[PDB]
Amino acid sequence: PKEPEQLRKLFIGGLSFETTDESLRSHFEQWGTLTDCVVMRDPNTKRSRGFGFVTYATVEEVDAAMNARPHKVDGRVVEPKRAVSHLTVKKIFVGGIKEDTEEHHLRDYFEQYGKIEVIEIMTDRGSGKKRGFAFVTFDDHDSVDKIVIQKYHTVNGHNCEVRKALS
Length: 167
Ligand SMILES: c1cnc(N2CC[C@@]3(CCOC3)C2)cn1
Prior knowledge:
By secondary structure, the protein is an alpha+beta fold.
């Protein structure tokens, strides 16, 4: 059972124009088996477009590569991101938590996706009653990107709806 290829891909932005298929592969093979690795180039000049893609054999290998950031590739710090499902944010909306879900429920669950900086459990402006949704802010976008591709999120026995949240 192979994970869908789309979930095993990293877009790599900010490449040095001297990075090649081969040097990008040599770099990112340190964190897993690469089934594909390409530098995007102009069709006429062959000059690099400054970005590429790598595809790992498993999602755990994608995780390993993201956890090894920052990546300096051929002398330049590059910008890896998981393929789109890019709206790059650090904050999620968590809905369906009802009125019994507390901060530690959200923290104990979401801390395994990334480092949490803010948890905001929403309350009614007039009564102070919990409204049944929350916002979690992380220190980095990959946490959110991992979270929103999951089909399900179970927190405090609730099946939650989780979406990217923007400013
Ligand atoms: C994260 C960030 N960017 C991504 N894009 C994919 C290729 C792109 C669209 C067409 O040309 C450039 C940019 C994907 N995932």
